Design an enzyme around this catalytic site. Sequence first.
Site, mmCIF file in Angstrom:
data_model
loop_
_atom_site.group_PDB
_atom_site.id
_atom_site.type_symbol
_atom_site.label_atom_id
_atom_site.label_comp_id
_atom_site.label_asym_id
_atom_site.label_seq_id
_atom_site.Cartn_x
_atom_site.Cartn_y
_atom_site.Cartn_z
ATOM 1 C CG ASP A 420 102.225 -27.612 112.411
ATOM 2 O OD1 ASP A 420 102.588 -26.700 111.641
ATOM 3 O OD2 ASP A 420 102.464 -27.718 113.625
ATOM 4 C CG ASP A 489 105.882 -21.963 113.271
ATOM 5 O OD1 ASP A 489 104.681 -21.540 113.407
ATOM 6 O OD2 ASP A 489 106.311 -23.043 113.748
#
Length: 654
Positions: A420, A489
């Site tokens: 990430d 996201d």
Amino acid sequence: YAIAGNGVRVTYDADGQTITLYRTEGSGLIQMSKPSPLGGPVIGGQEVQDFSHISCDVEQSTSGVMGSGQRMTITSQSMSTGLIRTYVLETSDIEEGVVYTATSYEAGASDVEVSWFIGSVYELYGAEDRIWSYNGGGEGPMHYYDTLQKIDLTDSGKFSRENKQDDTAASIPVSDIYIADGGITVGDASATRREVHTPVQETSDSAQVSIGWPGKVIAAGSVIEIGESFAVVHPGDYYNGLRGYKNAMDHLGVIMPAPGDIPDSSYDLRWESWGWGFNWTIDLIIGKLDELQAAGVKQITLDDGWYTNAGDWALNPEKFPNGASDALRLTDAIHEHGMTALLWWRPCDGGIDSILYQQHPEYFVMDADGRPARLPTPGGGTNPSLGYALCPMADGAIASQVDFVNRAMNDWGFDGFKGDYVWSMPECYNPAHNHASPEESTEKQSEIYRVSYEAMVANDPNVFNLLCNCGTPQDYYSLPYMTQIATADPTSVDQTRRRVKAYKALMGDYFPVTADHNNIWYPSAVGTGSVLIEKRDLSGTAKEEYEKWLGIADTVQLQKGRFIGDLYSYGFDPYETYVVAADGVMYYAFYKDGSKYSPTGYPDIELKGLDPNKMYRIVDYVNDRVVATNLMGDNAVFNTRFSDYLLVKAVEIS
Ligand SMILES: N[C@H]1[C@@H](Oc2ccc([N+](=O)[O-])cc2)O[C@H](CO)[C@H](O)[C@@H]1O
Ligand SMILES: [Cl-]
Ligand SMILES: [Co+2]
Ligand SMILES: [Mn+2]
Ligand SMILES: [Zn+2]
């Protein structure tokens, strides 16, 4: 002059020096593109348009990049530059909709300096009031700029986006534009990452999609290849175009994981500790495990905040006061509740205050001024949490990643990884690395992902692996090494749902995708055929709501079903619609809550892809009620009222 491939026709006019693309429909052709000019070099800020037709050659029975099919070779000449251009187009007897293109240039008596090369441009034929577009660029904006973009032809504005892949952009080298009758996809035909743009530009009454690459000095009397591309003509929406690209890219050895090899645990419902931010503790996580197990969760992520520094990836003493035995206590407890355990990390980041940077600066990327280079945010710039970039060609950098994998799996008992919070890779100027060029670091970023995954697999073939280039489309050349994809996201229901369709197109219909947990949208997660995940510590009615939807997801299990993307067209069929086939039953999901595409009024619902001779009962499986008692497959149309979503299954009735 014309060549043919399965599903596609390509014509060249020598008077025009233009190319027209057609797609087969029923017994006849449909014209996908307006006659479009051949791509040219840019010199002194201007594309050269003095090129004149020399010859066109057509071969009917040949073998190219995609195997057996056809070839058209066009030679042109520019008197002002001395350049001779060779433009090659290939079709395939087997591959549907696909055209392969390659360009070379020969210089004459003097050197030619080219700033940029435009490969191919296609302007869409037959547009009316709107065109929808898939935009794979990595230049940002992060988070709040949609990957799917409507090009409105009735407004004042003119849409323009470059769609970059470079030292500040690491996403997907593809763009698509489409209307009701279908569209044109353009993508980079390269087995390895390179600098490229796939621009999307509104025109006077339509839009165009293109591809282009960086320039170079061409020496006198020299021949150089400048770039290669795949184009896909298709019916329907971006799904069909992206699927074409996937099929094409197989021929270059970029092959996504087959269904039979994807581990069971990569289809599991998951809860992550991120709900608590940095204030999680081991005992807080353990305390939730009984209730998570009973509600149907089978996987746990230890999220951000566990480590001392990136690069080192050592246990934080405040979170693990007893060292490794504390990490084992956590993963043992997870295992005792029948679950797998995942660990958060940031690949490519060697830290700033890390022991790694102090002891081994030679492992890191070096900028033009001789300073350590920070990992970039999309479009350029940096972030306070992002450290110095590891150079993918330094053996010690790669080893630091492998050693982390081996420690986390074999010493701490983790079963997989959530990569990430990283994007592209800066250019490296360290002379001790002996780089072919400064861009080599950027090009080889994906070697970090490959070598890491190979080490993971050697410990456990069922290891889970994911990477989130958050707020952007995922790094395309990372995708072969993944077991699951997140929509990354998403900031809206529109973002998460439409991205599920895009990733399914590129990766395969049984490839695991999660709708993510940035906002609570359980109906979006289920109906798209995605894996439902959560991060919050819930109570009261919100807890009941999570339990309910875990139950539904665990009952229908559409995350394991065959996604079907070719029946409905986003932005042209009346509702935003998704379809999954599971255990021989068709499941449909209709949404009205996406502000980017939502109907006026209450249009009828049409169920597509059923057997024409059979009769079906339509059940809302969320509420356990019949919305339509008996529909024939050839006329499966009904009206029912719903405010946000409708999730139904078509049950065959004898
Ligand atoms: N998508 C990730 C990711 O989300 C972010 C948060 C901030 C930023 N950012 O400031 O660019 C980017 C991605 O990291 C978070 C931890 O820090 C969580 O693990 C999320 O699930
Ligand atoms: Cl989007
Ligand atoms: Co992320
Ligand atoms: Mn406009
Ligand atoms: Zn280097």
